[PDB]
Design a protein around this ligand. Structure first.
Ligand code: GTP
Ligand code: GDP
Ligand code: GDP
Ligand code: MG
Lengths: 439, 83, 56, 50, 57, 300, 430, 430
């Protein structure tokens, strides 16, 4: 009776969903058909899969997920790919025309004919769940239907359900690495839209992950499959407490109650440790003291942001494996003593710890090593203010000459949205500054 | 508390002294030709092990030995071949 | 009889210490074996992904 | 004498062990229609010609 | 020597211990035994009547 | 009281001490042999097994009462086959002493005095003759029905198939009587008054007396000549009279030798130190060992 | 006769209750299936204090387990000794608390507590002559610190004559387990000081210190911590279950321990505790027991006793021991450390004796003492609360459920006045 | 019953302490396990002097092992007889002194001595009637000198009435181990004069001379050297543990050896000493023992007593003997060598008799005397100190942690008065 429903919108969400859902299938022992292995013959079947999977009454399991996209290419791959018979046929919604990197296209003119279909499917899944903890969403901010539909769905969910917790794993554009040209335009438009509609947001830009794989996994030419495997591991550790018993359990609802000092301050960046290949795993002892220090390294963060340039407001970390309450306490005390890491003055108590017993699982054909301990750390800091400023500068550079705006204003949106969205972002930039100064 | 078998290498130690019976290549002269000497000494390894810090943390305990020995303390009981 | 009670009762503590020490010695042996277990698979997978990196 | 065959539990002598193959949690308690309910495990019979 | 055991006296669960069988009338050796008379001279159910006096209704 | 582990041994020891204390205090007509002759009536089938109720009833009849919990411990300890019934034979097997050596010495010599014809068995009337003679000076040898009239002083014992009592039971009955009485002097006085026989060793040389004697020997030597000497002096007597040059010392030679150096030890005292000094028990002691013990010994 | 019902909530409460019930079952010789298998008669006379009776001769504890989420309840049901609790004593919600005092005390616990109040009313009416209640919960958590405190309040106006006992795991800032812990801690303390009859503070730092420096075991676990807590719990009430030279129940303990009604916060400690590798050198004597009793590092709280003065103290001894030895040791330790005891009360130590030691041991003791040194914890919690409340960070989460800052201000003022009056008696002289 | 506790400081103290406990255990027949297996009952009557009773009837020594670095104590624990010492009696740090007096007395000793001070306070509390202390350490080391002498100051303040003994091994300048010897030797003496009831000076040169010349050992080792010290240590308190014709404890020796409180520096000797090849040819008698007792080559110090006057002396006799020869031997040696005895105290010799000789010997004698010839050892120490101090060599290490040159001036200043005090009480005549 602890169910979470995940939303995957856009190509970034769907390709993350493929890697995310192959891990859950292997973790809980489900074959690509939704059926348990034919031989099996153990008995005492444990229904820990109810968090993500649903029983059909006799036979297969159907995930509690929905996929949205306007281009039919990626969905048709899923419907033809390895897991064709896993997902329900009518929970894979596909459009006919792409958004074409335009926020207005997927928010005003063509996104209104699909949003009705998804809300019907969401209601059916939610009515099935009896202990729904909340929603998870996966979207790419620098995209058309990723930010268009993603903003529209979040707005609709706010009035349809309300107090239900919603978590957001957005993918912000890299500081210098870029695939498109108009990312800053729809980055702010989406961020302003989801500013008052999401509860917790996690930054998942790409350049940070590229650096991590090169530095740690000794991979000189990574691909998107490698990146989506790392992100899925973050999700698994994040929700591992709802299906595996531990010494100290944590819940989805006990994240937005501790990491959010104020309603407008809910942006945070994540870190994971140990992200290590077996080259260096054969040598390191990988103690709990060592892993908890490596989680605080700025080079190990999942977002292109330096915490050394700002203060820490709150940090939450989850341990899974064979950790002991002795060494978690001892190592945490050392972190507080360290001068290189500092907290804001009005927050003397600044941690939350969760302990789980299940060691992380390993995916065949994967890149990570098999370990006994792991930690996932979600911290809210003031240093996120720099990513908005750098993203703001590029927008102001284009918007001076009103470039590319005819591609937007002719698709149902008014000219005034650009100013107010920029206006809203400007207030937030030094809003993080006001909270970070001493009393 | 386990039975002692005849033939395998064993250790003989004195209880008031905790010193293992030993014999080395030390010459001695007597009417019965040339023979060596028998004494008591613990031929332990020279390398030291941080046992005290292990005890305070709680990793090892005193009765379990920590330092190896040299084969000069090894003795074997030999019995008759035929009944 | 008081002398007998002292000897009879202290013997319980003697057995008591042996049980704990023996089982604690057992636990470390199992846990150490699990550390050998991890590096067993990791050693194979190093020689594994080495060939995979050459292609593709 | 009569020495105990097994160690008795004491404030620091139980020592739970958690080195299992899989640490899975079973959902035995469920709240449906604002009514408490639990699974009927440890009670099932199998068959007979009765 | 050995760890700590939970179950004493080796009490096997009745789940696997034999099978249900016809003893449902174990208590009902005195179940149709009313007590208005009875428990005054006898403790077991009274025999079926063979004779009745006038006005037995 | 929390008879989890060793507690079974402690509580049953407490019960045994309490029973011994009770019986010794009353000291009178009650006897441990009286208890065993009560059980078999409740035993019925002579199986040797009794339930908790019958066991409690029998003990209460004797006049012994314990806690309600204390009865549980006895049953738990003495129900060896776990049939729910105590073993009174095992219970009476315990709480029974082996009798002191001095008491055994006195009981054996009385039996020897009675049995002057050395068969090891004594006719019942021969005993009863003595018990009646000591009780009065005017009983006279002859009686009308003397055998049956005087046999009531006896038959507290038991006789074998032949009809005579054995030495084994004669001691066995008296050691049973040795539980109601816990005073050695009172036991000896009772036996001697009953049997008209009062013969026993006066005493035995104690460790304190031996230490005093040996300290007297070692101190007397030091007064002679000087510190480095007196070893030659001690060896000189052996040189003067040890003709066979074997190097062994005898009790007669040691006595005479100690007579020479103004030390007249009593024969009983000299025997005690002689016996303590040697452990081979052939009556001969090496002179080197003797001089070592006398001179070069750190402890008194 | 004078039975007590056990009610508990929260994750920590559920775990502590599970360990305590396992310890009690072992002590009374109850198998996991619930059938009595004791060997002595003394283990059956007073079983009615903690265990009820059902058909077939089995015993079920009068325990009530409550939580807004069934996670820990589900975890504890499948464990050993989990079949003793009847299914009707399990009450659970559907949403959860989220480490929020407001959610656990006003919007969810308030609407859910009707069923558990019905259950506790049924148990209290079923018992012959109730002696009191006892609580195990955590102040730093949401559902525990809210629902348990509200239930304490309600049962307090409903039964104004029965005794109250609590076992509160007060948070320590060294283990900042929850960033919103000061609000919950101060609100729970403000609620608790108004109704709770006895309070015993337990700190994870103190438990870690015990398990690391005394027991010397390499891998501490919450199992061991809960075992320590459960041993401390059973020590205080052993005398209520077993005979002894001097009998003392919870009412007598309170009578001989609490000087003033607002001063009802204590620290507990259990002896003897020794390592496996060092047990062969120590002895088993009452002087050794009492010298380990008063050791500062042996306490189960962060408060250090030699920084303050022992107002009152009480000891509950288990095993066969001598009144001479125990009271002479008490008098000697009282005389030699006159600076550590307040002056205007002579003989501020109570002695209690029980003849039944814990299984596998020959002597034991439990120490409960009211010392003025606990104000350090209150001062630290209050200073963190006021520092974090000056900016009123995280306050919107609590305000969203209709709460007002006037209650926060009143709770802080009550805590400050408690600290002031509690410090005043430290310097008080005759 | 008048038991004494043992404190072992420094690397030398650990090595001296190891061999000393081996001899005492041998003298009482104690196995390394801890179970008594003696031959006579007298070996058990006074076992409480050095050993505490534990579970199972085993005995544990009441000795505290102290050092900043555990490297030295690490080797002794693993070797033979490493099992007697209770693990709670070992205290160690993480850095080490490194032959720096101030570092082991101001920086590291200050923050570490709290632990050891608590342990020794517990030991002195456990004993019914403490008789005195004894300390074995080195004045040429860092941990032995600095933290070792500081603990003497603290316990002196807490226990101002009990007697204290120190077996100080002041290193000699003929061959030296530490180049900073004069500094930490001088400062220790300044702190030791006003707190130590007695001083027992031991020199390495005398130990080497005895082995080569008296024992004729071609390859002596520290094991042999430690045994000679250990043999004398047990002989000092032999009469306290065993019966005898005349009884004398440590306090009685203090009364008859110290005319003025500042004159408490003794020098020791032990007799008899012979090689294996000469045991048969030598007859042991009282005239033979007293001849070797007063021989200058026998004494434990490099200072020659023939260059001064014996202020007082004391002789302890072990073994059964009469009293007339002992009384007259002390009288005759006093008359014939009257030039070596100061006049204003008549009959300045103390005699005691114990009737339990050491194992392997029939008679033994321990000699302790107060002679003015000990001032010569102070003279050369001051000679080396001022030669190094005038250039301020190695001074940056001492003054790098708050020590000031003002301390050095008084340390040497106090030494001059002691040297002058001995000289004035060497030529004065009635
Ligand atoms: N990290 C990561 N990012 C991805 C992945 N796939 C797509 N993206 C992100 O998606 C952004 C562009 O959006 P698209 O891939 O075109 O998909 P979209 O978000 O639905 O946008 P549309 O093309 O308008 O439908 C790129 O900037 C990428 O950062 C992926 O597999 N991993
Ligand atoms: N001693 C002990 N403390 C525990 C245990 N479980 C949890 N805790 C403590 O409880 C705190 C968290 O309480 P929480 O779970 O939020 O309480 P809840 O909200 O009422 O369920 C942590 O700081 C832990 O230190 C346990 O089994 N033993
Ligand atoms: N008599 C004796 N002296 C020793 C022994 N071991 C070392 N020493 C002396 O101790 C001196 C060195 O002392 P040191 O170790 O620096 O003292 P610490 O710094 O206080 O530990 C050397 O001059 C040695 O002569 C021993 O076993 N016996
Ligand atoms: Mg696209």
């Amino acid at each position: 009776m602890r169910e979470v429903i995940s939303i995957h919108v856009g190509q970034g969400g769907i390709q993350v969903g493929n890697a995310c859902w192959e891990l859950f299938c292997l973790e809980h022992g489900i074959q690509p058909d939704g059926q348990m292995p034919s031989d099996r013959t153990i008995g005492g079947g444990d229904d820990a899969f109810n968090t993500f999977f649903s029983e059909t009454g006799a036979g297969k399991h159907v995930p509690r997920a929905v996929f949205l996209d306007l281009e039919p290419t990626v969905i048709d791959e899923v419907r033809t790919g390895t897991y064709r018979q896993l997902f329900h046929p009518e929970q894979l919604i596909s459009g006919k025309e792409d958004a074409a990197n335009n926020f207005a296209r997927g928010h005003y003119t063509i996104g209104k004919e699909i949003v009705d279909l998804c809300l019907d499917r969401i209601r059916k899944l939610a009515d099935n769940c009896t202990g729904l903890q909340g929603f998870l969403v996966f979207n790419s901010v620098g995209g058309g239907t990723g930010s268009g539909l993603g903003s529209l769905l979040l707005e609709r969910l706010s009035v349809d359900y309300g107090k239900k917790s919603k978590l957001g794993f957005t993918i912000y554009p890299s500081p210098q690495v870029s695939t498109a040209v108009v990312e800053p335009y729809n980055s702010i438009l989406s961020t302003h839209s989801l500013l008052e509609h999401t509860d917790v947001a996690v930054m998942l830009d790409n350049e940070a992950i590229y650096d991590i794989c090169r530095r740690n996994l000794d991979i000189e030419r990574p691909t998107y499959t490698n990146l989506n495997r790392l992100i899925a591991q973050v999700i698994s550790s994040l929700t591992a407490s709802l299906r595996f018993d531990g010494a100290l359990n944590v819940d989805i609802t006990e994240f937005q109650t501790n990491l959010v000092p104020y309603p407008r301050i809910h942006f945070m960046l994540s870190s994971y440790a140990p992200i290590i290949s077996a080259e260096k795993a054969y040598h390191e002892q990988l103690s709990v003291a060592e892993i908890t220090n490596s989680a605080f390294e700025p080079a190990n963060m999942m977002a292109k942001c330096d915490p050394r340039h700002g203060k820490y407001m709150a940090c939450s970390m989850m341990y899974r494996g064979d950790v002991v309450p002795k060494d978690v306490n001892a190592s945490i005390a050392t972190i507080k003593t360290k001068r290189t890491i500092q907290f804001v003055d009005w927050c003397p108590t600044g941690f939350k710890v969760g302990i789980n017993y299940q060691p992380p699982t390993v995916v065949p054909g994967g890149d990570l090593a098999k370990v006994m301990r792991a930690v996932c750390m979600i911290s809210n800091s003031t240093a996120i203010a720099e990513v908005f400023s750098r993203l703001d500068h590029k927008f102001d550079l284009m918007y001076a000459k009103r470039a590319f705006v005819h591609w937007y204003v002719g698709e149902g949106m008014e000219e005034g949205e650009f100013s107010e969205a920029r206006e809203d972002l400007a207030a937030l930039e030094k809003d993080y500054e006001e909270v970070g100064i001493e009393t | 508390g386990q039975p002692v078998r005849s033939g395998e290498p064993v250790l003989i130690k004195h209880i008031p002294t905790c010193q293992w019976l030993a014999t080395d290549n030390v010459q001695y002269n007597n009417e019965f030709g040339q023979e060596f000497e028998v004494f008591c000494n613990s031929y332990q390894c020279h390398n030291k092990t941080q046992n005290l810090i292990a005890e305070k943390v709680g990793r090892k305990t005193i009765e379990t030995p920590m330092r190896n020995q040299t084969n000069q303390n090894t003795f074997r009981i030999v019995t008759a071949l035929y009944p | 009889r008081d002398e007998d009670k002292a000897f009879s009762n202290q013997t319980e503590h003697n057995r008591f210490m042996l049980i704990n020490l023996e089982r604690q010695k057992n636990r470390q042996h199992r846990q150490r074996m699990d550390e050998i277990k991890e590096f067993n698979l990791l050693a194979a997978k190093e020689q594994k992904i080495k060939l995979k990196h050459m292609y593709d | 004498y009569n020495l105990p065959k097994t160690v008795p539990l004491l404030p620091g002598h139980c020592f739970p062990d958690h080195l299992k193959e899989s640490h899975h949690k079973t959902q035995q308690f469920t709240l449906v229609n604002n009514v408490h309910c639990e699974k009927t495990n440890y009670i099932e019979e199998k068959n007979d010609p009765y | 020597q050995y760890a700590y055991d939970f179950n004493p006296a080796k009490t096997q669960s009745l789940q696997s211990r034999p099978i249900e069988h016809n003893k449902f009338s174990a208590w009902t050796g005195d179940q149709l035994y009313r007590t208005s008379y009875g428990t005054h001279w006898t403790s077991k159910p009274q025999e079926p009547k063979t004779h009745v006096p006038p006005g037995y209704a | 009281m929390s008879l989890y582990g060793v507690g079974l041994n402690v509580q049953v020891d407490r019960i045994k001490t309490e029973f011994r204390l009770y019986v010794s205090k009353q000291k009178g007509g009650l006897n441990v042999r009286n208890l065993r002759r009560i059980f078999e009536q409740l035993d019925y089938q002579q199986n040797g097994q009794l339930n908790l109720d019958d066991f409690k009833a029998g003990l209460n009849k004797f006049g012994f009462f314990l806690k309600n919990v204390d009865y549980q411990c006895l049953l738990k300890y003495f129900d060896v086959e776990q049939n729910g019934n105590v073993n009174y034979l095992a219970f009476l097997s315990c709480i029974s002493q082996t009798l002191n050596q001095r008491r055994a010495n006195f009981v054996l010599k009385v039996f020897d005095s009675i049995d002057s014809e050395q068969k090891g068995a004594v006719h019942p009337f021969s005993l009863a003759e003595r018990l009646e003679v000591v009780k009065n000076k005017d009983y006279q040898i002859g009686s009308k029905t003397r055998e049956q009239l005087v046999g009531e002083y006896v038959a507290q014992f038991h006789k074998n198939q032949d009809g005579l009592i054995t030495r084994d039971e004669f001691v066995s009955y008296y050691e049973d009587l040795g539980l109601g009485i816990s005073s050695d002097q009172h036991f000896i006085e009772i036996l001697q008054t009953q049997w008209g026989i009062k013969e026993d060793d006066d005493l035995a040389i104690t460790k304190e007396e031996v230490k005093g004697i040996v300290k007297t020997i070692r101190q007397k030597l030091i007064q002679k000549t000087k510190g480095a000497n007196d070893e030659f002096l001690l060896r000189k007597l052996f040189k003067e009279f040890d003709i066979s040059n074997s190097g062994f010392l005898t009790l007669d030679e040691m006595n005479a030798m100690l007579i020479k150096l103004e030390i007249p030890i009593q024969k009983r005292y000299l025997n005690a130190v002689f016996s303590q000094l040697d452990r081979n028990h052939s009556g001969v002691i090496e002179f080197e060992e003797f001089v070592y013990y006398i001179v070069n010994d750190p402890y008194p | 006769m004078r039975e007590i019902v056990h009610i508990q909530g929260g994750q920590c409460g559920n775990q502590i209750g599970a360990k305590f019930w396992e310890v009690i079952s072992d002590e009374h010789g109850i198998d996991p299936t619930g059938t009595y298998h004791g060997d002595s008669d003394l283990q059956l006379e007073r079983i009615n204090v903690y265990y009820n009776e059902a058909t077939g001769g089995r015993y079920v504890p009068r325990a009530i387990l409550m939580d807004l989420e069934p996670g820990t309840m589900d975890s504890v049901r499948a464990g050993p000794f989990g079949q003793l609790f009847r299914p009707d004593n399990f009450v659970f919600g559907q949403t959860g608390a989220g480490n929020n005092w407001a959610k656990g005390h006003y919007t969810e616990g308030a609407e859910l507590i009707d069923s558990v109040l019905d259950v506790v009313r049924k148990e209290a009416e079923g018992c012959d002559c109730l002696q009191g209640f006892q609580i195990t919960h955590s102040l730093g958590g949401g559902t525990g610190s809210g629902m348990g405190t509200l239930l304490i309040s309600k049962v307090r106006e409903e039964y104004p004559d029965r005794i109250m006992e609590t076992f509160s795991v007060v948070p320590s800032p060294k283990v900042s387990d929850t960033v919103v812990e000061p609000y919950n801690a101060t609100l729970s303390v403000h609620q608790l000081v108004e109704n709770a009859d006895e309070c015993m503070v337990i700190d994870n730092e103190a438990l870690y210190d015990i398990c690391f420096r005394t027991l010397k075991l390499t891998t501490p676990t919450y199992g061991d911590l809960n075992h320590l807590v459960s041993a401390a719990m059973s020590g205080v009430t052993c005398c209520l279950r077993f005979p002894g030279q001097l009998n003392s129940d919870l009412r007598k303990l309170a009578v001989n321990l609490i000087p003033f009604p607002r001063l009802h916060f204590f620290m507990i400690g259990f002896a003897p505790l020794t390592s496996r590798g060092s047990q062969q050198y120590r002895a088993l004597t009452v002087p050794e027991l009492t010298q380990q009793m008063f050791d500062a590092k042996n306490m189960m709280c962060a408060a250090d006793p030699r920084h303050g003065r022992y107002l009152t103290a009480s000891a509950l001894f288990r095993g066969r021991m001598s009144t001479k030895e125990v009271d002479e040791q008490m008098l000697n330790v009282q005389n030699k450390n006159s600076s550590y005891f307040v002056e205007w009360i002579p003989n501020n130590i109570k002695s209690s004796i029980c003849d039944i030691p814990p299984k596998g041991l020959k002597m034991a003791v439990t120490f409960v003492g009211n010392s003025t040194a606990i104000q350090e914890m209150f001062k630290r919690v209050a200073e963190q609360f006021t520092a974090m409340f000056r900016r009123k960070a995280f306050l919107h989460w609590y305000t969203g459920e209709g709460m007002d800052e006037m209650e926060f201000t009143e709770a802080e003022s009550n805590m400050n006045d408690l600290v002031s009056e509690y410090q005043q008696y430290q310097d008080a002289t005759a």
